[PDB]
A paper describes a structure:
Acetylcholinesterase (AChE, EC 3.1.1.7) and butyrylcholinesterase (BChE, EC 3.1.1.8) are serine hydrolase enzymes that catalyze the hydrolysis of acetylcholine. X-ray crystallography analysis of these cholinesterases has established that catalysis takes place in a 20-Å deep active site gorge and involves a catalytic triad of serine, histidine, and glutamate residues located near the bottom of the gorge, denoted the acylation or A-site. Among the 10 aromatic residues interacting with ligands in the hAChE gorge, only 4 remain in the human BChE (hBChE) gorge: Tyr332 (Tyr341 in AChE) in the P-site; and Trp82, Phe329 and Trp231 (Trp86, Phe338 and Trp236 in AChE) in the A-site. In the present study, we extend the kinetic study of Macdonald et al. with X-ray structures of BChE in complex with decamethonium, ThT, propidium, huprine 19, and ethopropazine, with kinetic data involving decamethonium and ThT, and with isothermal titration calorimetry (ITC) measurements.
Crystals of the BChES2-propidium complex were grown by cocrystallization in the presence of 1 mM ligand. The structure of the complex was solved at 3.0 Å resolution. It is apparent, because of the absence of a residue equivalent to Trp286 in mAChE (or Trp279 in TcAChE) at the gorge entrance, that propidium binds very differently to BChE and mostly fills the gorge. The phenanthridinium ring is slotted into the groove of the acyl-binding pocket, with the amino group at interaction distance from Trp231 (2.8 Å to the center of the 6-carbon ring) and Ser198-Oγ (3.3 Å), and T-stacked to Phe329. The alkyldiethylmethylammonium moiety extends to Trp82 of the A-site at cation-π interaction distance (3.1 Å between the 6-carbon ring indole center and C5). The second ethyl group of the quaternary center docks against the propidium phenyl group (4 Å to aromatic plane), suggesting an intramolecular cation-π interaction. The propidium phenyl group is oriented toward the P-site residues Tyr332 and Asp70 (C16-CZ 3.6 Å distance and C15-Oε2 3.8 Å distance) providing additional, if not essential, opportunities for interaction. Propidium is a P-site ligand in AChE, but a single bound propidium in BChE extends from the acyl- and choline- binding pockets to the P-site Tyr332.
Residue numbers in the entry:
A (entry chain A): 3 to 529
B (entry chain B): 4 to 529
């Protein structure tokens, strides 16, 4: 029968017959205790033992979220929505093993995104039944406490220290370091890879000293800690704890007695509050995310990066072509799913204070002027393409580019990619192009299947990036093959080579958006 | 050779040039000397003279302050007057081809000097070559400049402002009533100036009074929409009162203020014009054009947009290093004897000297816009940046913006781009094609081979002479030859212009569109 003896107990999975083969999927193994009762809003502890054999054979609890229903019934909005009922006992992990059980297969651990408030491992696209078989590697998947339950930070106080959600991952990565050799995995060749908050969490694990021995390499897909939304300042994050307690009716006597009120009230009672906690919110506001807790993160991430106090390893970071367009349909004026969404001049201007509330009028006019240099004016699609690039470069494109530039300075091979392919089955309209988060379908090898109505060009592309994603994990270079493939050069600060991922042609280019990103580096900080 | 004018007879020289000869009349009076009572007032028309004027010598130059920054340097004193200074300076010079032509087209030169210096008597302004090779008539002028030519008390005819501009207008009116007897068509007259005549010719397109004195215009590195061209009537009246207390003359009425100012000797007025502006720029026009109500109905930018101007052909153009001539006159780190490599800080200090009143946030905006280098290693790059932020904002962008709005009313605008640096340029090489050195090639000085001008500088000067003259005659700059690029018109959409260099002249599109887009659409906010 199919059972593996953990250093922790016994768990069994299933047979998933894939592509005409088989994989071993142990899905929903706990790596910590149910964080309710006497232990929530705090870091997780190591789980003791179970005597009954654990049936780790169905998607465990998605951790509680504020479920997005701004457009009910639509696929693309309900696609990222958790596939499992919500609660606080949510600290499980999925792991798919290629069958037959391998010898020292390279391990990959996916960190889901969602802006440190949403997201869950149980989603259909975060799944590695493909990656496990096509390249014969082990794929691990985790669920961490998201929102105010894993990122409520009272600095120094153990009862709510901060970045507990990031500590869930550190414990989840510790489980794989303890007992994945029983599954057949190589605890020495372990690659992190995430997206939009996982890529941000992947980068934060390059900083945390407690994780310097728990993985080998990193892959950052449209995310990094130097993004303006990744880490919030300490005495602004500690504040949004006090206003939360002020919100739930808790008057202060000291700073410790208050936490016990935070615990008594209901789970969804407090997630109702993750929207009012920040008054000047914006569609890219992280109301409760990572911060400087002194234990997980010694200082602000930009300081440790500049001083070079991070894990010296090889990374694979890249962005998509139209990251910013996903955030315009959630509040920006004149932007809808069922339009073509043309805008005039100042709906871009007022489309700036929605994303830049605390910026001077000179700052917004500087943003407007720099993104107004038209190649063709009377082109009506100008201002909507401009606003998408404004949100895209400020939040994901440049933060990933300059991170690699600074990471490359310390002498480790880094590779950058630019995803320009729009999937045919993307349910959102065409004006949003290659949208944020819709490249992971290719990363997990979904087009590799013929029954999802994916065209042949996309599956050749999916098999291409799955091969290099896997090759980088085992070897350190995301090479395709030799004697028929386009070489992926290393990114370094002087030439800044990056690889394009599309169906037309995988090209080598230099200095991605160097003219645009210079604004957000050399001028906008001075505004 | 002797002739007769409408107010007497002049007696002119003869100039043996190019083997041929050309007749000159240097120092003809076109206005009564504005001395004593008549100073600060518009020029009064001249009277008959019983004598017969001998126009055989360059007349005196108007009272001005000498550029003594570099004593002994030919480059700084090339623009200093060669005649003795006096207020009796409203004279004009005419050059006429031999034999006397039938109806030769006339070209009137307006000298520059920031409305503070300059004269017709400079060697760079010698028209004896233009009249010989093209058989055209070139007429030079002398107009009052400085306080004695542009003192502005708006409304009061004792000092109404723009008298220097009226000195020009009276000199044009002299041409259309005398040049027919000289051998030229009065109704085919072309105006060409440089950097203050270019701004003056640009102003003659706006004044209804001068609509009848010329046919077409030629602007060289200057326009009325330049930021230094026209002073607002507010501050222009401060500079008048600032000049009063500097000369101990602050009194009740402006009748009494001009009385003492009219009684004080000229250099007591001249030596104090550097203090009328508290925030003095190397391009600070102490006393220039004003919105007086007589020459300019209102501010010039509103007349260009509304459309009450003389509709005709123009020929505008600038050079690629217009701004570097002003960097050695106050900008720190820049100097004439040194490769003027500056740091980033010396670039910011230079910005404060040329942009005193604008924001700090605005100074960082013009900084960041001009640091997208083609090559980051280039140490020269910060030096070249300051040279163009003051070249575009002052000369390049206003000139391009002038023809764009001028041509939009159905007129034929022709834009050039003088790229060649003269081999005889007495200033160092880091300044490139400097502001005001197109004039040597416009007047045809390199054609006399007794000077150290390369052959590549003659055929350039010889070219520029024909096109300038043909534009005066036929309305467009043709050059009669098969192998020479036909200069197309400048319009708002495609924006074609012709560069002028020694190797060959090619045409380009939308000169410095990226840089001026910052000065057109972003700088007026900061
Ligand atoms: C589009 C869904 N996603 C999970 C795809 C992988 C990416 C997360 C995007 N994403 C979403 C978001 C948008 C729509 C639906 C669900 C979540 C979001 C939603 C709210 N209220 C507040 C902040 C964010 C947010 C903040 C930072 C980053 N970096 C990404 C973010
Ligand atoms: C002398 C050379 N020039 C007449 C070219 C033919 C150009 C005049 C440049 N030029 C000069 C200047 C600079 C150095 C030496 C002499 C004059 C100048 C000097 C002072 N104090 C104040 C204003 C200006 C000025 C103002 C506006 C414009 N548009 C040009 C100007
Ligand atoms: C699979 O690979 C792992 C690691 O790649 C091997 O384990 C050890 O790897 C280290 C590298 O740091 C070597 O120094 C050791 O010599 C390796 N072990 C041995 C016994 O040689 C491992 O051997 C491979 N095979 C299995 C079954 O794990
Ligand atoms: C990509 O390049 C790596 C080298 O960086 C190749 O790695 C070698 O792979 C073979 C087995 O395929 C190993 O025996 C070698 O030890 C590897 N070399 C190393 C680790 O330096 C890799 O094969 C390349 N990818 C492909 C598809 O050929
Ligand atoms: C006309 O305006 C000028 C400036 O606009 C006045 O002169 C000076 O302005 C500077 C501006 O920084 C001040 O620092 C000085 O204090 C001003 N001068 C004096 C004497 O206070 C000028 O005063 C104005 N004209 C009149 C007649 O007052
Ligand atoms: C061409 O260059 C020569 C020097 O190489 C100049 O010669 C000088 O000319 C001046 C007249 O301006 C005389 O006073 C000097 O005595 C000459 N020097 C020598 C060494 O002969 C010549 O003048 C230049 N050409 C022109 C037209 O000025
Ligand atoms: C599961 O798959 C394995 C490998 O293909 C096979 O040997 C086994 O018979 C299958 N069924 C069970 C119940 O293990
Ligand atoms: C703290 O939160 C309160 C809530 O309104 C408010 O004073 C402000 O947003 C924060 N103050 C500081 C100093 O961060
Ligand atoms: C797009 O549809 C929205 C729906 O409310 C509307 O507000 C907007 O004006 C439309 N844009 C157009 C028609 O360009
Ligand atoms: C010189 O001027 C005289 C008039 O005095 C004229 O007759 C003659 O043609 C001119 N040119 C010469 C002599 O070459
Ligand atoms: C005026 O100059 C002319 C030039 O030949 C000559 O008659 C004489 O030098 C002057 N005439 C008188 C009357 O002084
Ligand atoms: C100006 O003031 C003086 C002061 O004595 C006076 O005599 C003169 O008549 C006044 N002029 C006018 C025009 O008001
Ligand atoms: C250039 O000359 C000026 C003249 O004072 C000087 O201040 C400046 O430092 C010089 N530049 C260099 C690099 O020496
Ligand atoms: C330039 O214009 C005139 C008048 O229209 C014409 O006679 C002459 O041939 C033209 N020159 C060229 C080169 O076309
Ligand atoms: Cl008035
Ligand atoms: Cl001015
Ligand atoms: Cl008064
Ligand atoms: Cl010849």
């Amino acid at each position: 029968d199919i059972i593996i003896a953990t250093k922790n107990g016994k768990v069994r999975g299933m047979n998933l017959t894939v592509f005409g083969g088989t994989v071993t999927a142990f899905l929903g193994i706990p790596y910590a205790q149910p964080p309710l009762g006497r232990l929530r809003f705090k870091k997780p502890q190591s789980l003791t033992k179970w005597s009954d054999i654990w049936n780790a054979t169905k998607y465990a609890n998605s951790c509680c979220q504020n479920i997005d229903q701004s457009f009910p019934g639509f696929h693309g909005s309900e696609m990222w929505n958790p596939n499992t009922d919500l609660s606080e006992d949510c600290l499980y992990l999925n792991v798919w093993i290629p069958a037959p059980k391998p010898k020292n297969a390279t391990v990959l651990i996916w960190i889901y995104g969602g802006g440190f408030q949403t997201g869950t491992s149980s989603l259909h696209v975060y799944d590695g039944k493909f990656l496990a078989r096509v390249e014969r590697v082990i794929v691990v998947s985790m669920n961490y406490r998201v929102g105010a339950l894993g990122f409520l930070a009272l600095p120094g106080n153990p009862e709510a220290p901060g970045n507990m959600g990031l500590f869930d991952q550190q414990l989840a990565l510790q489980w794989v370091q303890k007992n994945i050799a029983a599954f057949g995995g190589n605890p020495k060749s372990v690659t992190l890879f995430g997206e939009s908050a996982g890529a941000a969490s992947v980068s934060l694990h390059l900083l945390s000293p407690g994780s310097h021995s728990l993985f080998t390499r990193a892959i950052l897909q449209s995310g990094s800690f130097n993004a303006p939304w990744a880490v919030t300042s300490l005495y602004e994050a500690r504040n949004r704890t006090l206003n939360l307690a002020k919100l739930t009716g808790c008057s202060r006597e000291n700073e410790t007695e208050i936490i016990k009120c935070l615990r008594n009230k209901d789970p969804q009672e407090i997630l109702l509050n993750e929207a009012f906690v920040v008054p000047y919110g914006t569609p890219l506001s992280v109301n409760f995310g990572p911060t400087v807790d002194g234990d997980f993160l010694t200082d602000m991430p930009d300081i440790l990066l500049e001083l070079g106090q991070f894990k010296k390893t090889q990374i694979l970071v890249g962005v998509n072509k139209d990251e910013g367009t996903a955030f315009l349909v959630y509040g920006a004026p004149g932007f809808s799913k069922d339009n073509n969404s043309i805008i005039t001049r100042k709906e871009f201007q007022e489309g700036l204070k929605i994303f830049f509330p605390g910026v001077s009028e000179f700052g917004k006019e500087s943003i407007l002027f720099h993104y107004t240099d038209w190649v063709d004016d009377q082109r009506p699609e100008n201002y909507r393409e401009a606003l998408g690039d404004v949100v895209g470069d400020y939040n994901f494109i440049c933060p990933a580019l300059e991170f690699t530039k600074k990471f490359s300075e310390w002498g480790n091979n880094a590779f950058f990619y630019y995803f320009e392919h729009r999937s045919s089955k993307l349910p959102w309209p065409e004006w949003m192009g290659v949208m944020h988060g819709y490249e992971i379908e290719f990363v997990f090898g979904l087009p590799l299947e013929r029954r999802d109505n994916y065209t042949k060009a996309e599956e050749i592309l999916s098999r291409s990036i799955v091969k290099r994603w896997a090759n980088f994990a085992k070897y350190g270079n995301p090479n395709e093959t030799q004697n028929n493939s386009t070489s992926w050069p290393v990114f370094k600060s002087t030439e800044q080579k990056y690889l394009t991922l599309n169906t037309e042609s995988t090209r080598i280019m230099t200095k991605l958006r160097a003219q645009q990103c210079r604004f957000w580096t050399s001028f906008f900080p001075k505004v």
